[PDB]
């Protein structure tokens, strides 16, 4: 229980604020000088950093944990494959070295066995890392032509604002081999000024649509059409609007060849227009049937059968739905095809094997996968016990589709559904993620519900190694963010899973208010004047973990970053003594009275309120971690983290908070320390090892 923290000078600096209830309020701010960039601050930072490192050096498990994190750090990433009209399969593969994934082509015209290795079953077709010799050019976006003969790709060099589209034949690889042989085998096509749209081929495979601006703010966008094997001078303007210079455009083409769709956007909401047109291919002076005119709702087209168009929309349905619009009638006949679900956001719909719809719902922060008929009958749920995120990849005419699945236990699993197979054998696993010292199958993701202070029911994710028991024994790592409508969705971290497996601990992720887990009302429920709910939900989660025997008492550690740092710091201030065993806030806000007076501060006003406004000060001040540190409560072992390289949140917040703790509870039984991140395999797990090792020791966990 040492008192040996370095002395922090206390100045006579007093800030004055205005309270709606109390009037003028003088607030002493003796660590105000830590706001400034001076030698005094730099020397105080070194003294604190050195203390922190001295404590970490008495923990020999830090270096042991580092090697385990080094082991599980690297792994390959991949996409689901696509079968093109040339009979070959194409897919992205990243071996885990370079920042850009490489596009592979199957050697044989057949679905590869992906347990053999990507280089054994595939050849490199497009390696974007060699666009520029130094790796300074990136592929932003790409698209194959419907006939499989050509490949369009948008390239962005690090300097430029815009990007440039290029075309190459699918028989012309770009690789380390190919560039060594001589000149790049692309076509001469160089489509400049491309920005903020997809690339959309016509179904004739003759050309593609793309958004472009004039040459050099961004104004007067043009949805254009580029013929393959031509210069940009040969291009057509499909649409522009002189009268609304800020407007942005999207396009789409129907598989049958009949329709060209124009989307129009005016702002950062999801509302959009939808005009429809009939084709021969794409030419100029298009007569647009203006179906969705006026900005009402989100409308994204799924597919069509003749004049019947299927559309995902949120018109009078916040959780989305599917409608049909029949265009053979003179007036379009709008009908509900798949109705809104009250408690399930319709996320994605794809037509599959012509007479079916594959479909993704998010319900209780989890994706569910459904198979529907062309008449809208729900035929079955696929992968019912899956806990995570799912997306669909397919082409409408083919007799299969894929699912890309991810969660806490894996960053990637490709599933295949084969309509031609026997009923019991339609669903299969194409491939899984390989990580040293970690099998995805050893980790179970569940969801439990607890009651917060005001009676609100919050779901919470629990992850464990399968040998760990819910018998009041395990340590728990409780992660949160708690703001900005940013959901704590399932995410993959080898560092965490290795930690759960090493110590028999559990990972706990509560869907606390302030996040986006149940839409804008959920955010609204933990924002500005309701912000205290965010903290009460987080605190009630930790109490629930112990009460219901998920974790042992005194063994729930908390961690979060940026807004999560404020969450952690505010929570150890507010929560009853002994609620938490350890605490690691990373780069967090902590002075909630001054946050808006520093770089990036103003953007947080919509989340916490404005301290300069008297009525808002009154609900802000009682939350401010820097102004609510008591003398008479034992704080849990606390390692505060800041990345001095990371501009985001000024380190001032953490400096003030640690100085305040060390002053208010100098004889605190557990160490209260601040660490400066060494990093702004070998050198990449150093900060994580210090962090997770501090927690393990603080919770009394042995290797």
Residue numbers in the entry: 7 to 222, 230 to 293, 296 to 695, 704 to 726
What does the paper say about this structure?
GmPOPB is the macrocyclase responsible for macrocyclization of amatoxins, eight amino-acid ribosomal peptides with the core sequence IWGIGC(N/D)P. Amatoxins are cyclic peptides further modified by a characteristic sulfoxide cross-link between tryptophan and a cysteine, and hydroxylation (the extent of which vary). GmPOPB is an unusual enzyme catalyzing, depending on substrate length, proteolysis, or macrocyclization using the same catalytic machinery. The protein contains two domains as observed in other POP enzymes. The domain containing the putative catalytic residues (Ser577, Asp661, His698) comprises residues 1–81 and 450–728, and the other domain is a seven bladed β-propeller, comprising residues 82–449.
The apo protein crystals belong to space group P212121, with one monomer in the asymmetric unit. In the apo structure, the two domains are in an “open” conformation, in an arrangement reminiscent of a hinged lid on a bottle. This open conformation has been observed in other POPs in crystal form when free of ligand. The catalytic serine sits at the tip of a loop and points toward the β-propeller domain. The side chain oxygen of Ser577 is 5.6 Å from the side chain carboxylate of Asp661; His698 is on a loop that is disordered. Ser577 and Asp661 of GmPOPB occupy the same position as Ser554 and Asp641 in the porcine proline oligopeptidase structure. Comparison to the apo structure reveals that binding of substrate induces no significant changes in the core of the propeller domain (rmsd of 0.75 Å over 360 Cα positions for the S577A structures). The changes that occur (relative to the apo structure) are in loops around the catalytic site.
